[PDB]
Amino acid sequence: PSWLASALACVLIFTIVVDILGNLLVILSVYRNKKLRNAGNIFVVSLAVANLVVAIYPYPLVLMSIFNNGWNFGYLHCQVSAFLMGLSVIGSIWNITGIAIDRYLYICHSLKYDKLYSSKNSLCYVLLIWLLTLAAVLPNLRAGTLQYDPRIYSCTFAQSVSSAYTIAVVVFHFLVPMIIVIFCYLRIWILVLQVRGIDCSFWNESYLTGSRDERKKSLLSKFGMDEGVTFMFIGRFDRGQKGVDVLLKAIEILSSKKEFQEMRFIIIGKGDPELEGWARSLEEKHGNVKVITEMLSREFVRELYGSVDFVIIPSYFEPFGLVALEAMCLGAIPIASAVGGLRDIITNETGILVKAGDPGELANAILKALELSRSDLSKFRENCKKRAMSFSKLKPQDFRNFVTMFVVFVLFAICFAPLNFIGLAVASDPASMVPRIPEWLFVASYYMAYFNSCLNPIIYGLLDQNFRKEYRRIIVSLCTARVFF
Numbered sequence: 001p002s003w004l005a006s007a008l009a010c011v012l013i014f015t016i017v018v019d020i021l022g023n024l025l026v027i028l029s030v031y032r033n034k035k036l037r038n039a040g041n042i043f044v045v046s047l048a049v050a051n052l053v054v055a056i057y058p059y060p061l062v063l064m065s066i067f068n069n070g071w072n073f074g075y076l077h078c079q080v081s082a083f084l085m086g087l088s089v090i091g092s093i094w095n096i097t098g099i100a101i102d103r104y105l106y107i108c109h110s111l112k113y114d115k116l117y118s119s120k121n122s123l124c125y126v127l128l129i130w131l132l133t134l135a136a137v138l139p140n141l142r143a144g145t146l147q148y149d150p151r152i153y154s155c156t157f158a159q160s161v162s163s164a165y166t167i168a169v170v171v172f173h174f175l176v177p178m179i180i181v182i183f184c185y186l187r188i189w190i191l192v193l194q195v196r197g198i199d200c201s202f203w204n205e206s207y208l209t210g211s212r213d214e215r216k217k218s219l220l221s222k223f224g225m226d227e228g229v230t231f232m233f234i235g236r237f238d239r240g241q242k243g244v245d246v247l248l249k250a251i252e253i254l255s256s257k258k259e260f261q262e263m264r265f266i267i268i269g270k271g272d273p274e275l276e277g278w279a280r281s282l283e284e285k286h287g288n289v290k291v292i293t294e295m296l297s298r299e300f301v302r303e304l305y306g307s308v309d310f311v312i313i314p315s316y317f318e319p320f321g322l323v324a325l326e327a328m329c330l331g332a333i334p335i336a337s338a339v340g341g342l343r344d345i346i347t348n349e350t351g352i353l354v355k356a357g358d359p360g361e362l363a364n365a366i367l368k369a370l371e372l373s374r375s376d377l378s379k380f381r382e383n384c385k386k387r388a389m390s391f392s393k394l395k396p397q398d399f400r401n402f403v404t405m406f407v408v409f410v411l412f413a414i415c416f417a418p419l420n421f422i423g424l425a426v427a428s429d430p431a432s433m434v435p436r437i438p439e440w441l442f443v444a445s446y447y448m449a450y451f452n453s454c455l456n457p458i459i460y461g462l463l464d465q466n467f468r469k470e471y472r473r474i475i476v477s478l479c480t481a482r483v484f485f
């Protein structure tokens with residue numbers, strides 16, 4: 001009805017006004033604030049420009065086309081209006097991809113180096129982003145995918161002209177960036193949780209008294225076995241989670257080797273009685289193996305981490321694995337599975353990594369660890385400690401900027417996901433699926449994606465305190481005249 005046409009005009013009127021003033025404030029704030037003037041925020045200004053180009057020329061033409069109830073301008077006006085929209089939408093999705101990579105590299109650099117991360121090639125990377133967006137929107141002028149759609153009163157990329165062109169745009173410029181940005185922030189969150197999880201006030205070798213060699217000889221004598229290269233496991237007894245079974249099968253491979261005599265194994269945990277029986281059987285057939293099913297105190301586990309030479313983490317799935325970080329804390333060299341989180345916290349210099357769910361590979365890794373002499377081990381324990389020491393280093397940091405940039409992405413994905421879903425549905429059969437798709441649904445998905453062009457400055461002020469403070473500073477400085485005497 002008549003109200004629905006005027007309602008869509010309100011959305012555009014709001015979007016145009018909020019995008020012009022809002023993104024002008026974002027660009028002005030980055031150069032008027034020292035805390036927001038960092039090089040890593042070149043991508044924010046790049047996105048702010050991308051957001052602004054639609055409200056100066058394409059959107060005003062569309063607003064007038066609602067009232068006109070048709071395209072009363074030229075074909076060149078329809079082609080340029082469409083070409084600049086693509087440069088904007090594809091520009092903003094690849095700019096969000098840029099920030100996602102920048103911030104993931106930031107947390108990794110601050111972990112590895114004492115010096116602050118300085119994105120030197122930032123002005124270079126944005127010039128490649130705009131080269132990539134121009135390479136994607138230009139072929140639509142020659143193909144003729146850009147045409148006027150009366151339902152949405154605009155000149156855009158028609159999903160029903162060429163189905164090969166639409167699936168390529170949906171896969172390469174929506175699904176490809178989405179997976180890159182989702183992975184980037186997923187890896188950041190785990191590392192922020194690992195930073196939170198660790199406790200250097202508890203897992204500190206100050207709490208331990210004597211020499212490592214003395215504390216080991218003492219711990220081994222208590223378990224009724226002489227001195228040797230000791231190994232430890234602390235986890236639940238399960239088939240496919242903590243991987244206690246991979247360790248037990250690997251001990252059987254080693255039991256025949258002459259090298260097994262110079263080994264000690266301290267398995268700790270409860271679970272499957274079948275796995276509990278198998279472990280108790282290897283405890284009876286060999287004096288090297290000691291199994292502890294009972295509940296152990298945080299204090300005695302710290303004592304264990306401190307005396308034991310190696311900690312085996314044969315986990316199948318382990319997202320955080322604070323266990324390895326806690327072991328490295330008190331200089332225990334880990335022999336862990338290459339799992340997401342375990343692969344993050346264990347560098348090739350701070351432990352020996354093995355392929356998960358392989359009893360043969362673990363046996364060869366335990367044999368590799370056995371060949372390491374007292375001198376070679378001392379540097380590993382030093383590196384393990386320096387690795388755990390760099391995780392607790394990032395504890396007082398203000399991780400609020402990551403949240404804002406994440407909300408930026410989350411909202412973008414909400415606005416465009418309906419539009420890109422329709423794109424694939426139309427691509428399947430452009431002839432039949434066009435009348436088969438609801439009219440309200442097509443209009444709403446389009447004006448949702450249009451509304452996104454004004455959403456970025458709103459959240460910048462709402463979530464990032466530095467932007468809110470500078471927004472007010474600009475608003476006052478532009479509207480508080482100077483008087484004399």
Ligand SMILES: COc1ccc2[nH]c(I)c(CCNC(C)=O)c2c1
Pocket residue numbers: 082083085086087089136137140156157159169170419420421423449
């Ligand atoms: C590829 O060249 C262009 C040119 C102009 C455009 N205006 C819009 I909105 C888009 C996104 C189109 N996405 C879907 C799912 O239909 C676009 C793309």
